[PDB]
Amino acid sequence: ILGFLGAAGSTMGAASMALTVQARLLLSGIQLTVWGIKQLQARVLAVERYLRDQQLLGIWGCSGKIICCTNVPWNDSWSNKTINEIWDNMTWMQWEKEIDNYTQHIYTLLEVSQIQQEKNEQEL
Amino acid sequence: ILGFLGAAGSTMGAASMALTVQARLLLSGIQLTVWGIKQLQARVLAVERYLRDQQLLGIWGCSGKIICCTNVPWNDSWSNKTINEIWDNMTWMQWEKEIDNYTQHIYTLLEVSQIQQEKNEQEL
Amino acid sequence: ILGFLGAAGSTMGAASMALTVQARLLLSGIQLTVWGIKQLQARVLAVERYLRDQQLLGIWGCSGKIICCTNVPWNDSWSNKTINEIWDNMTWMQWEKEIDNYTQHIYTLLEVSQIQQEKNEQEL
Amino acid sequence: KKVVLGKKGDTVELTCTASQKKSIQFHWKNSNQIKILGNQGSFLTKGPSKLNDRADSRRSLWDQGNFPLIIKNLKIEDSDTYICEVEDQKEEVQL
Amino acid sequence: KKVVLGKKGDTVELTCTASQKKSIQFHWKNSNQIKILGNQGSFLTKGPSKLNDRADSRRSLWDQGNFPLIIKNLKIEDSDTYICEVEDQKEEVQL
Amino acid sequence: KKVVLGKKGDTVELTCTASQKKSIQFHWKNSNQIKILGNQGSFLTKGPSKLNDRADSRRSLWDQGNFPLIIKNLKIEDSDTYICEVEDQKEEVQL
Amino acid sequence: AKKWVTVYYGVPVWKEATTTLFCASDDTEVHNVWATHACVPTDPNIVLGNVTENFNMWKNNMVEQMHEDIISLWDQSLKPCVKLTPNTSVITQACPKVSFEPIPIHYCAPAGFAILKCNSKTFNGSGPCTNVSTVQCTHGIRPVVSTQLLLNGSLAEEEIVIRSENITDNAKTIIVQLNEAVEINCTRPNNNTRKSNIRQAHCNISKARWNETLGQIVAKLEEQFPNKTIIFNHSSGGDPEIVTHSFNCGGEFFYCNTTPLFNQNITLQCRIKQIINMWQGVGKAMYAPPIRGQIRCSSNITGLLLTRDGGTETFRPGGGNMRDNWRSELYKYKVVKIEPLGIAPTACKRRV
Amino acid sequence: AKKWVTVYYGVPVWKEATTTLFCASDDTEVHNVWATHACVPTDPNIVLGNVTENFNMWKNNMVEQMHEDIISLWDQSLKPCVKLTPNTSVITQACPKVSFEPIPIHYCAPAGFAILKCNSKTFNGSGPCTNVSTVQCTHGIRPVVSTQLLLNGSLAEEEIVIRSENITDNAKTIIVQLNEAVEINCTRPNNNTRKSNIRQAHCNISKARWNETLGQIVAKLEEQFPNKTIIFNHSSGGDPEIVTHSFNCGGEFFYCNTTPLFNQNITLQCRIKQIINMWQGVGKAMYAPPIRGQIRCSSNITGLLLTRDGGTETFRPGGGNMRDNWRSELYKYKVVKIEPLGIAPTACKRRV
Amino acid sequence: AKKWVTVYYGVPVWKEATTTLFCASDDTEVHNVWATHACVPTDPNIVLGNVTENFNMWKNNMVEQMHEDIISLWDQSLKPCVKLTPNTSVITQACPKVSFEPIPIHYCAPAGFAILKCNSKTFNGSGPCTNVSTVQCTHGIRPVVSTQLLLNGSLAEEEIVIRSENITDNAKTIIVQLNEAVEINCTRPNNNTRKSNIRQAHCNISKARWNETLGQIVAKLEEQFPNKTIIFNHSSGGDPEIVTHSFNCGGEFFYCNTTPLFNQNITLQCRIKQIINMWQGVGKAMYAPPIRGQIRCSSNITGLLLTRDGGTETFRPGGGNMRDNWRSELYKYKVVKIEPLGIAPTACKRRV
Ligand SMILES: *[C@@H]1O[C@H](CO)[C@@H](O[C@@H]2O[C@H](CO)[C@@H](O[C@@H]3O[C@H](CO)[C@@H](O)[C@H](O[C@H]4O[C@H](CO)[C@@H](O)[C@H](O)[C@@H]4O[C@H]4O[C@H](CO)[C@@H](O)[C@H](O)[C@@H]4O)[C@@H]3O)[C@H](O)[C@H]2NC(C)=O)[C@H](O)[C@H]1NC(C)=O
Ligand SMILES: *[C@@H]1O[C@H](CO)[C@@H](O[C@@H]2O[C@H](CO)[C@@H](O[C@@H]3O[C@H](CO)[C@@H](O)[C@H](O[C@H]4O[C@H](CO)[C@@H](O)[C@H](O)[C@@H]4O[C@H]4O[C@H](CO)[C@@H](O)[C@H](O)[C@@H]4O)[C@@H]3O)[C@H](O)[C@H]2NC(C)=O)[C@H](O)[C@H]1NC(C)=O
Ligand SMILES: *[C@@H]1O[C@H](CO)[C@@H](O[C@@H]2O[C@H](CO)[C@@H](O[C@@H]3O[C@H](CO)[C@@H](O)[C@H](O[C@H]4O[C@H](CO)[C@@H](O)[C@H](O)[C@@H]4O[C@H]4O[C@H](CO)[C@@H](O)[C@H](O)[C@@H]4O)[C@@H]3O)[C@H](O)[C@H]2NC(C)=O)[C@H](O)[C@H]1NC(C)=O
Ligand SMILES: Cc1nnc(-c2cccc(-c3cccc(C(=O)N4CCCCC4)c3)c2)o1
Ligand SMILES: Cc1nnc(-c2cccc(-c3cccc(C(=O)N4CCCCC4)c3)c2)o1
Ligand SMILES: *[C@@H]1O[C@H](CO)[C@@H](O)[C@H](O)[C@H]1NC(C)=O
Ligand SMILES: *[C@@H]1O[C@H](CO)[C@@H](O)[C@H](O)[C@H]1NC(C)=O
Ligand SMILES: *[C@@H]1O[C@H](CO)[C@@H](O)[C@H](O)[C@H]1NC(C)=O
Ligand SMILES: *[C@@H]1O[C@H](CO)[C@@H](O)[C@H](O)[C@H]1NC(C)=O
Ligand SMILES: *[C@@H]1O[C@H](CO)[C@@H](O)[C@H](O)[C@H]1NC(C)=O
Ligand SMILES: *[C@@H]1O[C@H](CO)[C@@H](O)[C@H](O)[C@H]1NC(C)=O
Ligand SMILES: *[C@@H]1O[C@H](CO)[C@@H](O)[C@H](O)[C@H]1NC(C)=O
């Protein structure tokens, strides 16, 4: 399960609300050989991708995180929409499709920002 | 193995001391199909719960941690005992049983504290 | 795969450069029963060691990290070489072999430093 | 207590009940704590009572939580109180 | 358009081409959009054309992306333009 | 060195030892480095020595780390020094 | 000096589990046929430190699964010719005879769970066990069904152990586990083909063994009732499946007069009968009549189900609840889960 | 009020996969022999919420694997005595007859992938499906090869569904899926041993069923062409494997005259022949001649491959591309991957 | 400019392993019977970059496991009628004859470990190997036991390779691996039933092959001793199992006179004998006497165990240590573990 929040089928705002509730409940505590092995192979792969991604994200300063806030401002040319228009009415699929062609630009900027901050900190 | 420190059978103080020692040693470096699969299914489940819990704990500001210190004071009404009475003489089972009915209250407070701090930081 | 960067066979400097590039590409997105089970047993063990090590490293203040910078100065008596001599010309195997007998001394110092800092912070 | 007191030569029926309808094991006893009649497993079990040769029940009703006790050829000498030890309750009834 | 116009009594050959050499299915049509000849699966398929009893191809060349069309016993009354609907192209040729 | 020197017509026994009791392979040699007697695998191996037809050992003692060497029909002409190449040691003894 | 709330992960605190266990076990026999698809091959192959746990055999839950799996096995495998369910509903089945010889099965924990075991020989009951270990699987248990005597079960390690939720009360049974088995040989010899006999059988119990065993039991019973002579009696009445001692071998339903045991070899008179009551629930069933040839059961008396009189003291055999029979073997085990998260007071603060 | 870039992990965004699926499936028969080593035992055993997905059966890729695995099976299992590849190259093989009866196989996703399924009965085509669910494995499909009639496939849930990439154009086929099957019985009886007959056979189609079916098809076709009378015709010409209706049972290659169907039982005249063209690529092959004894096929007509005239309207049977036959069953499925990482505008900032 | 200590995880630094490997391998034959439960089915199916590793065949440890597993196999499978252990202890066993034909087995790394392999053809010895790759499993090795000639092993890739820990010293053996095999045919024909012959046998070696082989060996030996003529001699003495050439086929213990090889076909005279010394440790064993019918061994001479004289130069055959035989195949492999943690100087500091 990579879709940790289960958002396909609902908008992003709802997904965030759902997470808060479920996380609380979880913390609170509120042929058979062939398919047996295949069922586990699937889980092992998913774990490996997860662990990998969690450290790869350090390149943007976001390792060990599910959610990570930046110091790179949004360029309105990439969307020209408000926060509620996007978060309340669009699903993640609709949203990523809307901005599918700015991805490399954005990722590049995130890397650059992280580099500059690391530089600035080591200078002191 | 969820019992990372192996404390069933000994008091909490001893368990913490044992961890420090073992962690040091570890860093320092000092039918066969049926049960084969079941042995792994057990490990895969345990890993998944572990990884999950490590991020769920972010709700209280404690993600990516085994041990996490707070900004929520202890309410003496929950115990009326000293630190050494609890840490030196009680096992984790005895301890959790002693305070079993304040759990939801405490968890609620931890969430609240985390929310307030996040709010305060984003205001700046 | 514990050799996350694949450095056997190349020098350390090259390995670090290779990581930066590959991490970027990855984020950017640019008998059959017997050996079946053995293949997974190997992965499950590796995962467990990984997760374990990531928290064991908290003893030196480096948990949840692949790379961790210190407050313990290098003692030149352990090497008497420059940064580029080591990073550009030696492989990890050559390097660890060169300093193989100072390991316990160094690990001890790292633990001590971490202890002192934790003490100093809680005093405030 | 509830009183259902008959006379010598009669036949009487008392009903003990369960709220959960689990065909729960139960035992009927007199004031001298002698087991008279009960439900053991799916079977009717009798105790060494003076009623051992006279009492019966309705097995098909155990599934509805109804544990009737029937005493045939009742004697006035059997006048006593008895307990319905069914589930949590210990209902006392005079017969 | 390309023009390859013969006379009554002749035999002519036109070649339609593909750039990818995939033995792609294709269909040859006249200006009235009547299917004449094409490649269906690995087989030669004909349509209800006046050329149905006269036209042919070279099956071994389909693997080279070459889809020739041969008309035997050509009549001047067959003078028309036709389309090579091969891959993306819709090449028009007069015959 | 240790000296255990006999005379012509005698029989002598020298003991070489191991500290680990591993029935270690070993070889007995003279000062001219000729292999005389040793332990190869679990077997007694002889070399092309003048003692090849006279020397022996005690196989059951190899398990105790004891590697005796017995020379029957000893000649004074065999007077030399020899090495116990057992484990790390290279003990020299005169016979 | 300021006390703060802190949280730890990996805290080894147990809670009782409500999960489902799986079966593991080892020629057309009905239990083997069932096991072929119902159970996995068994496991080819941990004492805890200073811990204490309150095991309670009368309030366990491993029992419900055992008493659901056995009914399913039994009902599928031993078809009545006529089965009546109470209005009423009557159905019929084909009735081939089947081989019937119970085999051991093991219950094993699913991923995420473990089974605690009490290793105290002087188990006593529902009080705390001071000797606890963990397993994935229980030992194998043969799902033998019988009424007055518990047959082919395990023996007590050293001494006869009397286990009862409330000895004093008498509305509850007493389960007696022997530390010795007594052999019983039951058979229906050939040349018994009369109609008015194919339904007659007898059992032999060693005289000395039986008498030695009762003397040992009484010495133990006297601990609870030290000023009274103990007399054993026969049954009081009720359904014949429990009035006399009932059991099943080879698919045949046997009944035996145990009066001589509770009143060379001791010989009991036994019978085989076609119409029985069900133990699966309320209802009746008819099974096909007996077959020719010599029939024999061979068994170990390992325990007794006794009750005591209310208001010298008297005890007698009884039974009928297969759940009681299951408890006599499952009392040593409990299934638990771990909740690896806890809270403790500390002496540190978060930097804010 | 300042908008910032933020990143989330676990974002459920799909992309189409380019992966390879594995086969799962259930006596020397060639498909069973193949399956023995080619396929795994099948899986003994999820509708999504408010999602929409553009499935496109004519642009799918599950097809290429199906059309590589079948050629491999077929070519290894049904050896021609003579096989000619075009210069030319000719090889030969031993030609034992083999049993030939297609069995269902399932395609299943490898770790990291899943298959989307469209559950809209009124599927229509390449437009968006508003009813989507996920599976690991598809239903089983029998890799039956035939030309004009699609045999032994699945039926439409309620109504005849006409699926075509471009109905208007006519350079493309029309796949008609029936919501009812029509039974056809084809056989070569004994006592037909003449040389100048072992190669003659006939098929019976129920008259009423065929006529009922065409009336239903026409009513549906008229939706596209409401002002025209619909006439069915026979084939135009070209290779005999597609001019007439071809199929294979028992390893024999059958050809049938379907003119009476597109012009009691309707009887078709059929033949069996030794020299055929290949569907695997361009080339020819000879197979060993027919055997003695009665030969029978039993099949369900489940669909048709039709084309329409260009420039009253006329339709006729045709076919020849096994890929078209595969699409008729694989149209409901798509394979995708998840890229769990996304970007969104937010209203927070990193402390620096 | 300030140098600081920093730590990295995932550092690919190797250390030698001390672990245990598992066996993998492919009719009552003793090795097959053993393998049935001792070994797993084999694996149906990586050169490193610029690395160097010091492999040392005389100081390896894969050998001890091979030389524990084989003794266990052998002792369980080939029962002596009389076995004497030195006081003394004598036991006996039933002695059926068994089929005896060694099969290859593979050693494979357990989870957490890998085996390094040296791929340098000119291996030479314990010095650094500049061509290193990794495997889980070694190639299969047949656990053949023999004394003077190494039979049925692998061949050198190009040239005869002479491997010896210390060639100069002579207290150690020389293992010669041939790059060519020489065929030898050994047999005991029928019509040899005399008592005073069932114990007589002979072997044929091609004259040319043997002579060609020695010329090649000498040319290689002369590299170490360029100014001396090389003479081969026969054995010096000691236990008969090593004085002459011993081997075992079919369970029979053969001895052969190799003098003609170290002094058409070359014919050697051989014998079969009932009383032998053990190679498993110090002691003796008796095996049941020989059987009737023709007996044949067929083998490849792949190497030699030679020693050299101390104080023209002379070499002779010898042997007796099965560990030496194992080394001749295991020299290419080493087992290692990874310690993914290291320290390096850097140029950054932690904020404090
Ligand atoms: C306590 O544990 C012990 C040990 O597990 C249990 O004792 C076993 O009880 C079974 C009951 O059947 C008994 O099984 C018989 O063993 C005989 C040994 O030779 C078998 O010959 C006999 O097979 C015949 O009878 C079966 C009846 O179902 C038939 O199915 C089978 O085909 C055979 O039938 C032939 O013979 C009959 C003769 O009457 C003839 O009519 C048929 O046509 C046919 O010719 C059973 O296998 C075990 O041997 C007992 N074990 C021991 C050690 O004695 C004991 O029952 C447990 N206690 C309880 C209450 O369960
Ligand atoms: C649509 O689906 C249906 C259902 O799957 C398919 O129909 C099946 O088609 C197969 C085709 O062979 C048919 O199989 C025959 O069934 C007979 C039933 O008794 C068998 O007897 C017969 O076996 C003989 O012929 C085989 C030919 O390959 C031989 O291999 C086999 O050894 C047998 O041969 C004996 O008899 C012949 C007589 O001529 C003699 O020469 C031999 O020497 C030998 O004596 C086949 O198994 C199935 O029964 C059909 N199923 C049904 C339900 O009828 C149908 O084909 C699918 N449609 C398409 C186009 O694939
Ligand atoms: C080097 O590798 C090669 C190849 O692996 C090894 O050569 C093989 O050596 C075995 C040794 O037995 C030989 O096996 C015999 O092959 C014969 C082929 O027909 C078999 O017939 C013979 O079986 C009989 O003898 C067995 C002895 O154990 C009996 O167990 C078996 O039941 C048979 O016995 C019958 O015949 C005897 C006749 O004397 C009679 O007394 C019995 O009562 C009974 O009638 C063996 O299987 C292999 O064939 C050899 N392989 C080749 C290719 O020739 C070689 O040994 C390896 N070198 C070394 C030193 O190990
Ligand atoms: C002090 C101190 N700090 N950390 C430790 C310590 C000592 C031993 C082990 C562990 C530890 C940490 C995280 C995980 C595990 C673990 O066993 N697994 C990973 C989760 C799934 C099961 C396997 C152990 C920390 O002492
Ligand atoms: C620069 C830079 N920072 N991080 C990387 C990098 C590049 C490639 C891979 C990884 C990485 C990180 C953590 C884990 C793994 C991994 O392979 N596994 C998880 C642990 C068990 C084995 C599988 C890879 C980091 O470059
Ligand atoms: C022994 O069992 C009795 C049964 O009621 C119980 O009351 C008692 O506390 C138990 N004692 C111990 C030590 O378990
Ligand atoms: C006791 O039982 C055994 C069992 O076979 C029998 O042989 C013996 O004769 C019996 N003896 C008496 C006296 O009851
Ligand atoms: C139905 O199929 C036709 C085929 O071209 C397509 O154009 C049309 O959009 C499809 N409609 C829907 C709703 O899928
Ligand atoms: C129709 O086909 C069935 C199939 O067996 C046959 O029996 C029947 O006689 C046929 N009838 C006619 C009139 O075609
Ligand atoms: C070759 O083997 C000899 C044996 O002692 C050793 O000394 C020498 O260094 C080895 N050379 C190489 C390159 O391995
Ligand atoms: C050994 O037997 C094989 C069997 O083919 C034969 O080719 C070979 O030449 C023989 N060699 C000798 C030396 O007899
Ligand atoms: C050499 O050995 C082969 C093996 O069969 C034999 O046939 C041949 O006659 C032998 N020849 C001589 C001359 O030794």
Residue numbers in the entry:
A (entry chain H), B (entry chain B), C (entry chain E): 519 to 548, 567 to 660
D (entry chain C), E (entry chain I), F (entry chain F): 1 to 95
G (entry chain A), H (entry chain G), I (entry chain D): 32 to 57, 62 to 80, 84 to 124, 197 to 306, 325 to 359, 361 to 392, 412 to 459, 465 to 505
Quote the passages of the study that discuss this structure, keeping the authors' original sentences.
HIV fusion is facilitated by the viral envelope glycoprotein (Env), a trimer of non-covalently linked heterodimers (gp120 and gp41) (Harrison, 2015; Lee et al., 2016). Binding of the receptor CD4 to gp120 triggers a series of conformational changes, including opening of the trimer, exposure of the co-receptor binding sites, and rearrangements of the gp41 helices (Blumenthal et al., 2012; Harrison, 2015; Ozorowski et al., 2017). The N-terminal region of gp41 forms the fusion peptide (FP), which becomes sequestered during the initial steps of receptor binding by moving toward the trimer interior (Ozorowski et al., 2017). Here, we identified a pocket in gp41 of our previous cryo-EM reconstruction of an early pre-fusion intermediate Env (CD4 bound and co-receptor mimic antibody bound) (Ozorowski et al., 2017) that is proximal to the FP and contains a bound detergent molecule used during cryo-EM grid preparation.
Compared to assays in which sCD4 was excluded, one small molecule, GO35, stood out, as the change in Tm of three Env trimers was observed only in the presence of CD4, suggesting that the ligand is specific for the CD4-bound conformation. Using single-particle cryo-EM, we next solved a ∼3.5-Å C3-symmetric reconstruction of a complex of B41 SOSIP, sCD4, and 17b Fab that was incubated with GO35. The N-terminal portion of the FP is disordered until residue I519. Density for the entire GO35 molecule is sandwiched between the FPPR helix and FP of the gp41B and HR1 helix of gp41E. One of the biphenyl rings stacks against the side chain of conserved F522 (>98% of all HIV sequences) of the FP and comprises the most extensive interaction with Env. The second ring of biphenyl is stabilized by a hydrophobic local environment consisting of L537B, A541B, L544B, L592B,E, and I602B. The piperidine ring of GO35 is located deepest in the pocket, although the density supports only weak hydrophobic interactions with the environment of I519B, L520B, Y586B, A582B, V583B, and L587E. On the other side of the central biphenyl is the oxadiazole ring near the entrance to the pocket, and it may form hydrogen bonds with the peptide backbone of the FPPR. Remarkably, the experimental binding mode of GO35 overlaps substantially with the position of DDM in the model used as a reference and with minimal deviation from the predicted binding mode (root-mean-square deviation [RMSD], 1.7 Å). The full FP from the DDM-bound conformation would potentially clash with GO35 as the FP folds back on itself, bringing A512 and V513 very close to the biphenyl core of the small molecule. This finding suggests that the binding of GO35 biases the FP toward the more disordered state and may force the trimer into a less stable conformation, as trimer dissociation was apparent in the cryo-EM 2D class averages, with an estimated ∼60% of the selected particles classified as individual protomers.
